Structure 1
Amino acid sequence: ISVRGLAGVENVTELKKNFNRHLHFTLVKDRNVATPRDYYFALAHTVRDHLVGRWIRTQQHYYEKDPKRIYYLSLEFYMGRTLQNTMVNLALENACDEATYQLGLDMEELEEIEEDAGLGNGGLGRLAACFLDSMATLGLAAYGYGIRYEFGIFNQKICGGWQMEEADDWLRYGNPWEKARPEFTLPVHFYGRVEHTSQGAKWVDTQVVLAMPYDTPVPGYRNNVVNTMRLWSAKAPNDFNLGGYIQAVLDRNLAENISRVLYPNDNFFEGKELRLKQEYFVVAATLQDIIRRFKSSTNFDAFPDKVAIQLNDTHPSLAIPELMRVLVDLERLDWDKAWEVTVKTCAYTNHTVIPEALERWPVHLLETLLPRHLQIIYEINQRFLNRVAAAFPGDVDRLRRMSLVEEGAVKRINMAHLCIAGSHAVNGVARIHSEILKKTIFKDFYELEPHKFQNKTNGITPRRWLVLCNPGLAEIIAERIGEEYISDLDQLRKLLSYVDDEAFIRDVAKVKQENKLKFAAYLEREYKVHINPNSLFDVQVKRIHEYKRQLLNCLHVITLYNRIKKEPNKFVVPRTVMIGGKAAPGYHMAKMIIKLITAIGDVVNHDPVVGDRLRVIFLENYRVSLAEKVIPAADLSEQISTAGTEASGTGNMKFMLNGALTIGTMDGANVEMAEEAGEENFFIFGMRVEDVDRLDQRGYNAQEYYDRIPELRQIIEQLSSGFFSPKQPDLFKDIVNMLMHHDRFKVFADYEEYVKCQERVSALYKNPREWTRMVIRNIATSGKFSSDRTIAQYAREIWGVEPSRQRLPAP
């Protein structure tokens, strides 16, 4: 059936009886009243049972061996479903598939019942998840620490072509993968004031909120290692939080609101108090847990030798001043020793350069909520600027530019500057992004401490993003080069010698056609629409953002439609362009773009002259589980952000690994992907970072493009006149206005080159054999983009630990 493992006679028999055991004793059901959800839960428990043993020994192991521990702090962990992932990493997939078959059930149908653990917004959150998988597969003693939101990313509904947000009550039916641990409940403080007494400062009269941990197992790939992802949940103390007795009890929900919902912002900062509370909550509980574990393993001199804390963006940046608070105020270490320790254990990862995404917290907020932390930040700033003054005497302007405190309307703390000053390493997520950080945004810091700056190009895990979602492709690859590539993706290079293999070429093309047929069916099954599986599947799925330019894609789609209407009887390569992604609730322009996409589809999809040559479909509720479905079925991957705006991107790597060709700009990781596959095997177009700068010096004037490109002007006039919105002719006035007068992302500037490039893609598609051979050269060179490579680099160049592919002593 496939290398989903073996289906042993004894193993299948054991699984079946345990499945029946859980259906009965755990779910209290019998075959006569059990629903598919019951069946899913019986299977989940049966599979979960196989982790317990490994989980206990792995943790037991780390206790005995006492290795250096890696702590990955993130406010997001975009996990998705975990049933299939667990079976894969445990080699149980075929056995469970057989067992359920014999019990008369369809395992695939059961898998669709699991809810996605959508505790993330997009790229940043999914990177943390891929990293967790790689760290376990590489035998690192790593822990993922975050917040257990009871409501993750909202479920997206399209109503009248508009996005509607609906609460993601993912825990409604229960989460079999988490393990509550009330024995490690910790107190977190807020507000209060600072008292300066004889022997040190004291933070008093604070409001207490308890942090209760929930542990989720993270299994490595077939090595018997099971690490932990610890998510904190807010719980109110039962005393004080006890005017009215009834009210006092109902009011407990005020403290517990801290972990209620994930902020739905992607690459956008919103300075709300609740968000700051969430950030301190996760930091305060995590560091107590880290130090407690360390004390078991009081000279904190060896702290950095046993502890590494990785900050995923600046969200958990309060870890720096919190570590100082604990070491100086509680452990009574002298400032300088505490600072040496802090810098040596902390490392920071930057994920974007757009200004609106940078965390700049108003000082009055930190003053009220965390008074002691504000004082420590001021002291850190003081000493840091003294260092700068010494290094660049008289450079008064550099002084204000590098300050962690920004003066102006309202004073603010620049969390990124805080992170650079208190970390021994700072990294970008793609070569171009890391260079841009040194050359622009953090130039002053790089000049001060060049040794701190590094790069760690992102990656994705080949387990979920290949074996799990595309078993067919994984099978034909393994048939030729073996299975060793699953945890050593570089071996994919060996596929280069099959580029002329008539058999391989036919197989690769076959799995893609099967994936497209399956997705096409899913589209009609759960969404009822109908699409032609013979057309080119053009897809752009990611969060809706002006910088990602779903709008540039829209212009091309309209261009295609207009060319068809001009010469109806001319042949054109049929296309099914699918765009999907969620817009943050308060992001007006992004919501306007979603409406534009659905409006274009309303016209195009019902034009008889167009026929089945062009279909515009908006993919509803894009999330991890849906990505696993569309990506393997894609032919063309759209990665068209304005050069210099997408730090790295990861969806791009997912598409490359699954047999889709890429059309994109020289941005983020796109640059390194083309470098690995060869630019001849990539569809690159548009301005490079340098051209964008040149245009900015000159001054970007959209009118110029509108004046010189008839096809462009026709589109804009179609939008303004109401051609795509009959009942509301001026519906899209905002978009047209932005495009013409305030386009920070120069959509028009890349239009001509994009359309031309798209023409070249259509020409290659007309030649199946050659299209497929290029795909093979992409798949064969995607090895570098595995998160196992990324993690091995973080491990060796930042954390100071050696990865290991050694199987743990059985379960």
Structure 2
Amino acid sequence: NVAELKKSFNRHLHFTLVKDRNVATTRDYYFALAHTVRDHLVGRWIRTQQHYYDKCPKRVYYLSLEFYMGRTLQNTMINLGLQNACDEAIYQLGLDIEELEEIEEDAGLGNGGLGRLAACFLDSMATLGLAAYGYGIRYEYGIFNQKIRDGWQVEEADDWLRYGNPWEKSRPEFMLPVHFYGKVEHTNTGTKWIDTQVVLALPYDTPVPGYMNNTVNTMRLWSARAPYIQAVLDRNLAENISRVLYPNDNFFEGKELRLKQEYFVVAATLQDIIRRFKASKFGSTRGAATVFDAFPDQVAIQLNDTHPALAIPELMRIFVDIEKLPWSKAWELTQKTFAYTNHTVLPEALERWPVDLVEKLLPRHLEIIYEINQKHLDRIVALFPKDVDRLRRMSLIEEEGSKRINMAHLCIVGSHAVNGVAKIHSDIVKTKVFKDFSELEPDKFQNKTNGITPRRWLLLCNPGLAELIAEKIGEDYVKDLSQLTKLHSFLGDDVFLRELAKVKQENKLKFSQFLETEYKVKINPSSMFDVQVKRIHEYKRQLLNCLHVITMYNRIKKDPKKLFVPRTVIIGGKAAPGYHMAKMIIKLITSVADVVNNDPMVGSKLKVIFLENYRVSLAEKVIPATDLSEQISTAGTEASGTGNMKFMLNGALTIGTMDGANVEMAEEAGEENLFIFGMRIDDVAALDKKGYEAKEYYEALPELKLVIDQIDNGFFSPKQPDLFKDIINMLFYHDRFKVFADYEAYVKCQDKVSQLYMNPKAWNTMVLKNIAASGKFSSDRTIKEYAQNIWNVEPSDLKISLSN
């Protein structure tokens, strides 16, 4: 209760932080609170893991190079049902829990959607009571902190562990060795991988609390550690493996250090998984072969993209070289164990490691990969005697010039299930990208539409909305989001609609406070919050948005008195350090913003803000305060998107193309309840066939012309007129994302948005239909499908009893 919590807080402030109320810092208070809450996880964490051992349910291992977790404090309190009591305790202690919460560093061990999906999945799996484990890397530095200097992005090291992470638990007794380089000998006692350099893998466990169910799963993250002065200093080399997260989103960078990270997670993970298996005492541990026949019935490993592809040849290595199992058997058990999820579209995102590199670092794995390919191709040849080109198409090796390994191909042949993350995407993957494989193995390919956890992305980030909905339809929706359809009953309820708007109103107010204390700008709280937050990339097209912003600005100047719905345009996101065009687009946006925000004639009519350091904790703030969600990727480029789901769940209307999950959002809530626009996948194809001539649009649309000329002649960069020539050049001759092609339809759609915004009742009526139809987008629904059609496991509804 409140009294015991205050007592605990004081106890930790004293014994754990070694402070008293007159000397304690804000960070000390945060730590005291964190520990007070953390103590409540222990009992259930221990019992949960003990339960999995006793009952031996099939376990799920989500293997990923990224886990975009954000902060843990508030999420733990909520899932533990502790928030209001801690709220009261901290208040009575004379402190502000909200300020204590801001002390916590984000666990930004991810780039964006891919990493955040893993995070949402862990929460859902814990809530569904599944015996699930998250396996990743404990990066000393996560996604860099972003600063904006003189309009340009500036990176700063994310030293998130500097003062200690109370949410992680070092597990010394489970340390393991990982091998690199060396050579291989095929002796008469099996093949041996020798002369290798060893790097220790130290696991750190972080509790994953299920929502109100006594289940507490585990996220195990590995850190690299080394097994006269210069020699000691050189231990840094081994430790560099888990030093930093590669800041690339949808872009493959074949650096050797990255390959080392991939094998690192994979090696430690699989060895730890096998150790756990061989300790489970599973039905008859009979020596030597020790069964392992039940391994696939007790273990499921999901490959989050191809980053951990090496897991396949690594399991084979363990089964064959160490466990001495016959190849055919090992391969069988291997396919039954692995499942691969594809999240990529762009050619530049595909992982293709040159063989030479892999030969040097992982000689034994290259051999195993060649053997897998050999057996793979033999069969195709067996099935298609007269189709030579089919062989080069399906091989795991691309021989043309420099030889490379197609990691996706390896994942496909080593897994019993391959899934995309959205209907439109899964179809492209199955019928186009991997047509040669799906024809041969139809039933292998599936779709699993992404989802987001309604705990973090609703109960946590928008308590006001969560409360309002609960009051009307009960709390059942938290565990069964489809229940939101009940909200349809209030479609004509004016009072409800009024209450809905107030909540949004309240969120916008709180966020506007944030905006003003952070940026010199003054926000019109009456303005429509137009938001586009996500990683900066050309396919995302924040550039298209920028064109519309300039378009709006030019309209205001031309007619300073016309009827206009005021807007606050917010665009945020990080650009990969080496992504030149992305960095230029940021400076463009900041440039435009400086002109827009300071032009006296526009004044409070329109404000532009480049939201700095967009990350999970910040997302939890801006999303709830949004009116219009920008999801404008070129049709066919956004595999799924998840930010789109968060905005929909939080009371915002969507403006976007028929791409990724946007299509299913339209399916669920009705197309007229979303502002869809632009080319669709078939249109983009026709354009590519006919040939994209950007100038065409430029010379045919005056509003666009003025925008482009202004950018190109220096209207937004007077002291440096040709700053954006790179953007111009790409926009006119190398824009593979057809920005000008969707401009007109985009601007026309935008005007429609404004019209609806003038009608509060109609706007909120559409909002309600969106929220009421967002149920399918709960990651709980996603995981159920995975569990049922891929992992072959079963959700459990129980509860770790405590007192008596």
In structure 1, the residue corresponding to 2:222 is in which secondary structure? Answer: strand
In structure 1, the residue corresponding to 2:603 is in which secondary structure? Answer: coil
Q: Where does residue 532 of structure 2 map in the other structure?
A: 540
Note the alpha carbon deviations across 1:739-794, whole angstroms, 9 max, x for none. 00010000011011000000100000000011001000000000000000000000
Which among 554, 563, 566 is matched to residue 574 of structure 1? 566
Q: Where does residue 194 of structure 1 map in the other structure?
A: 184
Q: Within 2, Cα distance between the matches of 1:484 and 1:810?
A: 23
Q: Within 2, Cα distance between the matches of 1:120 and 1:734?
A: 29
Q: Where does residue 497 of structure 2 map in the other structure?
A: 505
Q: Within 1, Cα distance between the matches of 2:78 and 2:311?
A: 35
Q: Where does residue 68 of structure 1 map in the other structure?
A: 58
In structure 2, the residue corresponding to 1:30 is in which secondary structure? Answer: coil
Q: Where does residue 802 of structure 2 map in the other structure?
A: 810
Q: Where does residue 159 of structure 1 map in the other structure?
A: 149
Q: Where does residue 254 of structure 1 map in the other structure?
A: 237
Indicate conservation of the 8 Å contact 2:521/2:597, yes or no.
Answer: no
1:13 aligned to 2:13? no
Q: Within 2, Cα distance between the matches of 1:458 and 1:308?
A: 19
Deviation at 1:439, TM superposition (A): 2.2
Deviation at 1:809, TM superposition (A): 2.7
Q: Within 2, Cα distance between the matches of 1:116 and 1:655?
A: 21
Q: Which amino acid aligns with 1:608?
A: P
In structure 2, the residue corresponding to 1:320 is in which secondary structure? Answer: helix
1:416 aligned to 2:399? no
Indicate conservation of the 8 Å contact 2:424/2:659, yes or no.
Answer: yes
1:687 aligned to 2:679? yes
Q: Within 1, Cα distance between the matches of 2:367 and 2:375?
A: 13
Indicate conservation of the 8 Å contact 2:596/2:607, yes or no.
Answer: yes
Q: Where does residue 6 of structure 1 map in the other structure?
A: none
Matches within 5 A, 1:171-250: 171-237=161-227, 245-250=228-233
Q: Where does residue 3 of structure 1 map in the other structure?
A: none
1:108 aligned to 2:106? no
Q: Where does residue 474 of structure 2 map in the other structure?
A: 482
Q: Where does residue 25 of structure 1 map in the other structure?
A: 15
Q: Where does residue 358 of structure 1 map in the other structure?
A: 350
Note the alpha carbon deviations across 1:671-690, whole angstroms, 9 max, x for none. 00010000110100001100
Greater CA deviation, 223-232 or 605-614? 605-614
Deviation at 1:167, TM superposition (A): 0.2
In structure 2, the residue corresponding to 1:300 is in which secondary structure? Answer: coil
In structure 2, the residue corresponding to 1:569 is in which secondary structure? Answer: coil
Deviation at 1:721, TM superposition (A): 0.8
Which among 276, 281, 293 is matched to residue 264 of structure 2? 281
Q: Which runs of 5+ in 1 are unaligned?
A: 1-10, 238-244
Note the alpha carbon deviations across 1:702-745, whole angstroms, 9 max, x for none. 01111211111111111111111101100000000000001000
In structure 1, the residue corresponding to 2:189 is in which secondary structure? Answer: coil
Q: Where does residue 7 of structure 1 map in the other structure?
A: none
In structure 2, the residue corresponding to 1:78 is in which secondary structure? Answer: strand
Deviation at 1:91, TM superposition (A): 0.2
1:617 aligned to 2:609? yes
Deviation at 1:391, TM superposition (A): 2.2
Q: Where does residue 518 of structure 1 map in the other structure?
A: 510
Deviation at 1:264, TM superposition (A): 0.3
Q: Within 1, Cα distance between the matches of 2:317 and 2:447?
A: 30
Indicate conservation of the 8 Å contact 2:631/2:654, yes or no.
Answer: yes
Note the alpha carbon deviations across 1:346-396, whole angstroms, 9 max, x for none. 000000111100000010100000000000000000011112112222111
In structure 1, the residue corresponding to 2:332 is in which secondary structure? Answer: helix
Would the alpha carbon gap of residues 605 and 527 (structure 1) be closer, same or farther in structure 2, given more than 3 Å must change? closer
Q: Where does residue 669 of structure 2 map in the other structure?
A: 677
Which among 362, 382, 394 is matched to residue 402 of structure 1? 394
In structure 1, the residue corresponding to 2:604 is in which secondary structure? Answer: coil
Q: Where does residue 652 of structure 1 map in the other structure?
A: 644
Q: Within 2, Cα distance between the matches of 1:390 and 1:786?
A: 44
Q: Within 2, Cα distance between the matches of 1:116 and 1:130?
A: 15
Q: Where does residue 136 of structure 1 map in the other structure?
A: 126
Q: Within 1, Cα distance between the matches of 2:731 and 2:351?
A: 27
Q: Within 1, Cα distance between the matches of 2:430 and 2:160?
A: 41
Q: Within 2, Cα distance between the matches of 1:808 and 1:312?
A: 30
Deviation at 1:430, TM superposition (A): 0.2
1:299 aligned to 2:291? yes
Which among 485, 488, 511 is matched to residue 493 of structure 1? 485
Matches within 5 A, 1:779-794: 779-794=771-786
1:272 aligned to 2:255? yes
1:775 aligned to 2:791? no
In structure 1, the residue corresponding to 2:234 is in which secondary structure? Answer: helix
Q: Which amino acid aligns with 2:255?
A: K
Deviation at 1:408, TM superposition (A): 2.1
- Aligned length, in residue pairs: 794
Deviation at 1:808, TM superposition (A): 2.8
Q: Within 2, Cα distance between the matches of 1:668 and 1:730?
A: 36
Deviation at 1:526, TM superposition (A): 3.2
Indicate conservation of the 8 Å contact 1:391/1:448, yes or no.
Answer: no
Q: Within 2, Cα distance between the matches of 1:126 and 1:810?
A: 32
Q: Within 2, Cα distance between the matches of 1:581 and 1:269?
A: 19
1:387 aligned to 2:379? yes
- CA RMSD, Structure 1 to Structure 2 (Å): 0.7
Q: Which amino acid aligns with 1:497?
A: S
Deviation at 1:806, TM superposition (A): 2.2
Q: Within 2, Cα distance between the matches of 1:142 and 1:771?
A: 41
Q: Which runs of 5+ in 2 are unaligned?
A: 281-289
Q: Within 2, Cα distance between the matches of 1:343 and 1:810?
A: 40
Q: Within 1, Cα distance between the matches of 2:373 and 2:610?
A: 48
Indicate conservation of the 8 Å contact 1:181/1:212, yes or no.
Answer: yes
Indicate conservation of the 8 Å contact 1:353/1:441, yes or no.
Answer: no
Q: Where does residue 585 of structure 2 map in the other structure?
A: 593
Q: Within 1, Cα distance between the matches of 2:100 and 2:637?
A: 40
Q: Which amino acid aligns with 2:254?
A: G
1:473 aligned to 2:465? yes
Note the alpha carbon deviations across 1:530-564, whole angstroms, 9 max, x for none. 21110010000000000000010011111111111
In structure 2, the residue corresponding to 1:612 is in which secondary structure? Answer: helix
In structure 2, the residue corresponding to 1:301 is in which secondary structure? Answer: coil
Q: Within 2, Cα distance between the matches of 1:77 and 1:283?
A: 15
In structure 2, the residue corresponding to 1:692 is in which secondary structure? Answer: helix
Q: Which amino acid aligns with 1:147?
A: I
Matches within 5 A, 1:318-337: 318-337=310-329
Which among 681, 690, 701 is matched to residue 709 of structure 1? 701
In structure 2, the residue corresponding to 1:255 is in which secondary structure? Answer: helix
Indicate conservation of the 8 Å contact 2:34/2:166, yes or no.
Answer: yes
Q: Which amino acid aligns with 1:129?
A: A
Note the alpha carbon deviations across 1:617-650, whole angstroms, 9 max, x for none. 1000000000000000000000000000000000
Q: Which amino acid aligns with 1:708?
A: A
Would the alpha carbon gap of residues 490 and 533 (structure 1) be closer, same or farther in structure 2, given more than 3 Å must change? same
Q: Which amino acid aligns with 1:266?
A: D
Q: Which amino acid aligns with 2:329?
A: K
Q: Within 2, Cα distance between the matches of 1:721 and 1:593?
A: 16
Q: Within 2, Cα distance between the matches of 1:642 and 1:201?
A: 50
Indicate conservation of the 8 Å contact 2:201/2:225, yes or no.
Answer: yes
Q: Which amino acid aligns with 1:14?
A: E
Q: Within 2, Cα distance between the matches of 1:440 and 1:354?
A: 14
Q: Which amino acid aligns with 1:93?
A: Q
In structure 1, the residue corresponding to 2:294 is in which secondary structure? Answer: helix
Q: Where does residue 740 of structure 2 map in the other structure?
A: 748
Which among 613, 622, 633 is matched to residue 625 of structure 2? 633
Q: Which amino acid aligns with 2:263?
A: Y
Q: Within 2, Cα distance between the matches of 1:15 and 1:611?
A: 49
In structure 2, the residue corresponding to 1:337 is in which secondary structure? Answer: helix
Deviation at 1:525, TM superposition (A): 2.2
Q: Where does residue 241 of structure 1 map in the other structure?
A: none
Q: Within 2, Cα distance between the matches of 1:78 and 1:716?
A: 37
